[PDB]
Design a protein around this ligand. Structure first.
Ligand SMILES: Nc1ncnc2c1ncn2[C@@H]1O[C@H](CSCC[C@H](N)C(=O)O)[C@@H](O)[C@H]1O
Ligand SMILES: Nc1ncnc2c1ncn2[C@@H]1O[C@H](CSCC[C@H](N)C(=O)O)[C@@H](O)[C@H]1O
Ligand SMILES: [Zn+2]
Ligand SMILES: [Zn+2]
Ligand SMILES: [Zn+2]
Ligand SMILES: [Zn+2]
Ligand SMILES: [Zn+2]
Ligand SMILES: [Zn+2]
Ligand SMILES: [Zn+2]
Ligand SMILES: [Zn+2]
Ligand SMILES: [Zn+2]
Ligand SMILES: [Zn+2]
Ligand SMILES: [Zn+2]
Ligand SMILES: [Zn+2]
Lengths: 330, 440, 582, 349
């Protein structure tokens, strides 16, 4: 079991399998790592949770479960003929959701999140600040402190907030210049801090660095109590409006590379954003082919254009997908 | 929409009290009282006054009148060592019509604060004006932050050496004041980009300073591995922050960005939640900045600034804002015997200082006729002599010939000392440290 | 005499094309100025108007100078600067003969443009005929005299000490101090003129052997700036030695070398003592020893009265105060504004400046008298032989020396009234021997060559005249003075030089100037000497001349003309015994 | 009252001290130096103007009493050259005696013959130092002048020469014997080798005459050397302090010194150069600049001489190919006051 890899069957193993019991090979690590929490445009895990192959997927029937499996994985590990039964099942309860741990040759490790954290920390040559996943019967509703624009609709469309809910969880202030430590603490605890610059073509008398600097300040007032397992995450998205010096300043203040998320339609690029984030599996979303010249000319054409400044709600859709595995979904 | 003449005309008719009307802009929304003369003064007037009260032209006189605080004309005071100026509207509207040209006729015209007479018609000088002005710059602001935590003194048997992040030290005043005060340092790393500044810091201080080059290249990881730190001081550049420049680059483009870099390092230096060390942090900046920049700085640093003027302890009118939580930053200045206070006392041999407490050190290429006399404060053996560098490095409290390094020209060390902290002010601010800290 | 049918009479100036030489300019003279015997046919006694020694050229290697630019060489002009100074002097004298009229390196390169352009024109105003002599200059020695005497030295026919290694003359009178061999009287005068002639670059101008700078070889190792001419190394050492020396990069000069012999040419083991005896005890007029005064009792030591001509930065008063000698009055004469303001400000104003020395008369000296210590130093800018524009002692700043002489008599007591009196005069060592003889004859005293290298960190070796007690005694190294440059550096800097002679940045000079003008490594990279560096090296107090603005160039050109503090302390030590002390 | 002085002294019987003798003015300021009596301010001014003045013939320009060169009388004995006036003799000696003295040929002046009384005339006892006192306390600028020696106490003059020969000039003035030994006059063609000891061991010198060579083919040595060497040699030849013997010098230049060197000479010798012009037919043929110590050197000084014309003359002489000839006439006349100081040789006989 331990001496034989379960991802691909190789006899050369290096450590215990992260999710379940069994072995794993070095290419199996790297392939899992490249899609450790990558999510597609459908809102679910892009690849398998074990073999990390997107060719075959098994959507879990549990409304609180998203992680899928593969036909080959279930046929080879659980046993032949189980794939058809799983596919034909109207309400399939996967393997990790239900408390049973023995199913054929597949053994479920109790408290998988601990060793997942351990392996993520022991592997990450380029790590990122991140908190342990909360179990299904211990998650809490999200608290968000929005900046400078309406942000509630994206969260409600993502299930993090409900229509008609009280404004005690989301606070939207365009004039946070007057904020005080007392004001921040009387708003209460916050788990996600979200901010962005207005879309290109919007009048802005104040310098753009405004929306950066105060954001950082609020982030520093929103840091959790030291030593708490509190899952606090933040990110900052810019619509290519800051200059290169400002980009360097933001990258240094956030201690994060500017991972961009371009949107290409029909082979042509019409809009792009730059993201500074600590969310896991966001470096895999980085695009290295984009260069400064075409994004700059597109931006200048955007100021030169008459079209109204429309905020790209679709590009930030993939940012909050992994947070489903952390917090409540309604 | 504003008729100051109608307000003053009905006030002189014993109808409206002067204290119930603002003088700077004539607004009827009176909240406080003007610190210089009797009469009310509105909140927008306060905002404009904080931007102009101590804004001095490189020439050496107040650029704008102290009452109106901004105008396309201004009258220089004929009395030396008194920079304060008034506008023609204020003279002909408060004191009385036909008084400005009469003042111009009198060549040694004394400003309404310098003159012995305290009554000038509707305009009368408050007797206790220095105290009210000090309250104006220190005892009222737009922030209501709680007082910073105070660290109880530690026993002398367990007083460790001090670790200092001296960002933007320039001429490296911080460690010089630390050594003179008697306190020792374990490590003293500073960020600086000027070659002359780092040369002076390395030479005159026997290499105790460890430089990190440009401050934009140091991250939180370096602070984490190079700590723990106790004292963090900062002297952020004021070229783009002071309202003296026409450009007004502000706090959000130019060298003002450097400020926030400081803040970042500060959040990487203060203890997270241990509170096991008496962490101290000091920030210095000019007095003549915009109110927007003032409140942004105050709210980011989470501390109410205190005004310290080098006038009360040295011979330069270098009034500055200090943010931080050193014990008794608002304590009144102490005139120590050791440090000079008067220009004449700290003057060279065979010279007479025709001024007192000079604040003009830039030669301005002899300036013009109006620039003459002011930029020229030394009269040696019946001929004018421009300020020597030894003289101004004496007045700032620095040791004699402190900055004779790297064979700099007169102008290079001119600009080097023109942005330097005053030594006695730093001595006053760091005096409480020796109580909490080890003494060599 | 001197008729050969090939022209080139006495007084004509043309180039020469001697062996291993590339058209060096010079003139033609007779025998009774070079000190040698009668010539012969084809034996043209050549008087190089430049910096060369005295030798002979034949008409075959002689070509008329009327075709100036036809045979002119650019490489020596633009890469070998004493050629430029020779061009200066020869063009000047040619223009003076023709009647036409039109920091040192900067001055010569600025001035040479109009005359070089006029040479390019073709000497139009006067013509080729206009180079005539001014109606006044109009045994046996062969061409290879040196190549023949050396040809017999290694055969042991003639003693090496019996032949001069500088000019090959048989009239050996004294022994060559630095190297073993004979030395003629003309060689004596040339050596006394140009032995300590250090250029602002930081290298000896001429050769160590013959004191003639034509094509010298740089001493590769630092702290050794001495040079060697190609002829001297080719003859005394042997053929092919110059090529081998120039082939290797860090070549060591022979007297700087580790072994005491280099063939026919070997170093004297006692060279320093012999050199010191030379520079102070071969001057060609003998005077009686200076009158010494009895030591006054300790209970009757009056305060000293000092008259300091050409005071500069008031080094005399500084040394007197550092010696703890009370000064009743210190009347100093100075014109430079920076010098006078530094002297007035750094001290407590005891210096009653008079101002211009050319205006003070005997009435002022009598009114301010009596004076019992007169010190001073004449301006060496126009008196040093290192100056290409050397004008002379009798014209220009050198004339001011005679003014000093005047005032000296104005303070010297009469034959009666035997009371203490002491005087001191400082001057450059690298100056003409005739000027030195005249200066020492006017003052009625013989000089002593005091080298600052004994006590100070620099090489400011100067002639000191006067009757102060104990000049002849050797210099004493005190505990509290700095000998090497390393002790004078600020912290965090490494000294490239054991000792320094360069204070002028020379606008980065050239690549050869690099590693010579930048004697300090500060940030693992070269740096220029700081303003306080010359203060510390010269023995001056720290930050002594930080008065007024005084940018780097001004402070450098002011500290370069000042005396050496420990040297003045040594010379003034007996005055503590002979005058009031407290 | 020029002719009323006799009436004043014989009738009113008043001391002649209170009345001027030179002109007869009642107002007086000091006593007359040469003879006992009074003198007025203009009289003493013109006395100092022509105290030791001499003419081309070698005698006094003006009278020794009234300072008038109209009725000068010669002296029979050559070593005395005093000249008197007809008016003075007719007023104080006695009327009618002037013609008697003039008619008969040989004559001994009152200053020469030891008679202290002759009519109203009276000779002061030890007056020779009284002349020194008069020059000291009755001059606005009494620079330097030595007490003269009597005819019987005159040693032969010992003269040094520098760069030029003065012996011809002295023999033309009869100061030295023709064909005599060179002990009393040694000439130094080249002086750069001399030392104080050797200057002393020629012997004491009462005169140091150094002249720059004339304009033309000047030696390669700079002209300033020609004056600095003379100053140094004069300093060597100065008499030993304590016995101030008559010591004089005269440095003369033939217009080969620039303005700065004139200033340097003025500082060195403390003497403003007295320009000596020579004009024939209204044309300035030549001129010399004299720094001298001998008395009566500023009397001949000419104000109309200007610097630009002298520079033009120097340029003209340099352009011309005239031979190097010294201006003998210009300097020959100036040594006349030394006749009173040094013994006279008659070479005509
Ligand atoms: N980008 C940058 N990084 C680091 N230092 C900088 C900088 N830009 C400017 N500085 C330096 O910051 C200083 C601001 S002036 C304050 C100097 C200091 N208070 C003193 O006592 O001298 C100057 O030394 C300036 O050269
Ligand atoms: N005409 C003049 N009168 C007086 N001083 C002069 C002068 N010309 C030049 N000098 C001064 O004479 C000095 C020559 S160098 C003298 C060295 C001096 N003892 C020292 O230690 O500095 C210089 O200071 C120069 O400025
Ligand atoms: Zn595998
Ligand atoms: Zn499930
Ligand atoms: Zn699978
Ligand atoms: Zn108002
Ligand atoms: Zn106003
Ligand atoms: Zn005033
Ligand atoms: Zn020789
Ligand atoms: Zn040689
Ligand atoms: Zn060597
Ligand atoms: Zn009269
Ligand atoms: Zn007469
Ligand atoms: Zn007679």
């Amino acid at each position: 079991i331990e001496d034989i890899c379960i991802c691909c069957g190789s006899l050369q193993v290096h450590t215990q399998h992260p999710l379940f019991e069994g072995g794993i090979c070095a290419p199996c690590k790297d392939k899992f790592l490249d899609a450790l929490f990558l999510y597609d445009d459908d809102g679910y895990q892009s690849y398998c949770s074990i073999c990390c192959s997107g060719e075959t997927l098994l959507i879990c029937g549990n409304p609180d479960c998203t992680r899928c499996y593969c036909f080959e994985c279930v046929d080879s590990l659980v046993g032949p003929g189980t794939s058809g039964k799983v596919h034909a099942m109207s309400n399939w309860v996967c393997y990790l959701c239900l408390p049973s741990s023995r199913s054929g040759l597949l053994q479920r490790r109790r408290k998988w999140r601990s060793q997942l954290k351990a392996f993520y920390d022991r592997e990450s040559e380029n790590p990122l600040e991140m908190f342990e996943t909360v179990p299904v019967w211990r998650r809490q509703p999200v608290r968000v402190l929005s900046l400078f624009e309406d942000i509630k609709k994206e969260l409600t469309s993502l299930g993090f907030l409900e229509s008609g809910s009280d404004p005690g969880q989301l606070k939207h202030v365009v004039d946070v210049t007057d904020t005080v430590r007392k004001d921040v603490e009387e708003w209460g605890p916050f788990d996600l801090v979200y901010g962005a610059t207005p879309p290109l073509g919007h009048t802005c008398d104040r310098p753009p660095s405004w929306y950066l600097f105060q954001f950082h300040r609020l982030l520093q007032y929103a840091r959790p109590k030291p030593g708490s397992p509190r899952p606090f995450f933040w990110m900052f998205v810019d619509n290519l409006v800051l200059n290169k010096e400002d980009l360097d300043v933001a990258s240094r203040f956030l201690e994060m590379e500017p991972v961009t998320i371009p949107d290409v339609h029909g082979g042509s690029l019409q809009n792009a954003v730059r993201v500074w984030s600590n969310i896991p599996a966001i470096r895999s979303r980085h695009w290295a082919l984009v260069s400064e010249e075409e994004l700059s000319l597109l931006a200048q054409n955007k100021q030169s254009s008459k079209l109204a400044a429309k905020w790209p709600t679709k590009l930030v859709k993939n940012c909050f997908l992994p947070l489903r595995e952390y917090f409540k979904y309604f | 929409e504003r008729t100051r003449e109608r307000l003053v005309y009905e006030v002189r008719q014993k109808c409206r009290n002067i204290e119930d009307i603002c003088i700077s802009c004539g607004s009827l929304n009176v909240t406080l009282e003007h610190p210089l003369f009797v009469g009310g003064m509105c909140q927008n007037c306060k905002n404009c006054f904080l931007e102009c009260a101590y804004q001095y032209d490189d020439d050496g006189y107040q650029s704008y009148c102290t009452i109106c605080c901004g105008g396309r004309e201004v009258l220089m005071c004929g009395n030396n060592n008194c920079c304060r100026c008034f506008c023609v509207e204020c003279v002909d509207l408060l004191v009385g019509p036909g008084a400005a040209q009469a003042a111009i006729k009198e060549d040694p015209w004394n400003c309404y604060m310098c003159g012995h007479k305290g009554t000038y018609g509707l305009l009368r000088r408050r007797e206790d004006w220095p105290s009210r002005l000090q309250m104006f710059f220190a005892n009222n602001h737009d922030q209501e932050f709680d007082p910073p935590k105070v660290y109880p003194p530690v026993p002398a048997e367990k007083r460790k050496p001090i670790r200092v992040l001296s960002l933007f030290d320039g001429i490296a005043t911080g460690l010089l004041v630390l050594k003179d005060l008697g306190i020792q340092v374990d490590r003293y790393i500073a960020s600086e980009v000027c070659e002359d500044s780092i040369t002076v810091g390395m030479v005159r201080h026997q290499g105790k300073i460890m430089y990190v080059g440009d401050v934009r290249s140091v991250t939180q990881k370096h602070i984490q591995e190079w700590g723990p730190f106790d004292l963090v001081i900062g002297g952020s550049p004021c070229n783009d922050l002071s309202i003296v420049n026409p450009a007004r680059k502000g706090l959000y483009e130019g060298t003002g960005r450097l400020f926030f870099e400081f803040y970042r390092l500060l959040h990487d230096a203060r203890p997270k939640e241990g509170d096991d060390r008496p962490f101290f942090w000091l920030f210095e900046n000019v007095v003549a900045m915009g109110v927007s920049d003032k409140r942004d700085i105050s709210r980011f640093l989470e501390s109410n600034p205190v005004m310290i003027d080098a006038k009360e302890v040295s011979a330069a009118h270098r009034a500055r804002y200090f943010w931080g939580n050193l014990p008794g930053m608002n304590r009144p200045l102490a005139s120590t015997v050791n440090d000079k206070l008067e220009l004449q006392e700290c003057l060279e041999h065979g010279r007479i200082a025709k001024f007192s407490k000079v604040r003009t050190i830039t030669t301005r290429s002899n300036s013009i006729k109006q620039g003459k006399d002011q930029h020229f404060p030394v009269f040696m053996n019946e001929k004018e002599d421009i300020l020597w560098c030894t003289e101004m490095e004496r007045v700032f409290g620095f040791p004699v010939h402190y900055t004779d390094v790297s064979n700099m020209s007169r102008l290079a060390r001119q600009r080097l000392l023109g942005r330097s902290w005053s030594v006695p002010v730093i001595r006053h601010l760091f005096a409480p440290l020796k109580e909490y800290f080890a003494c060599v």
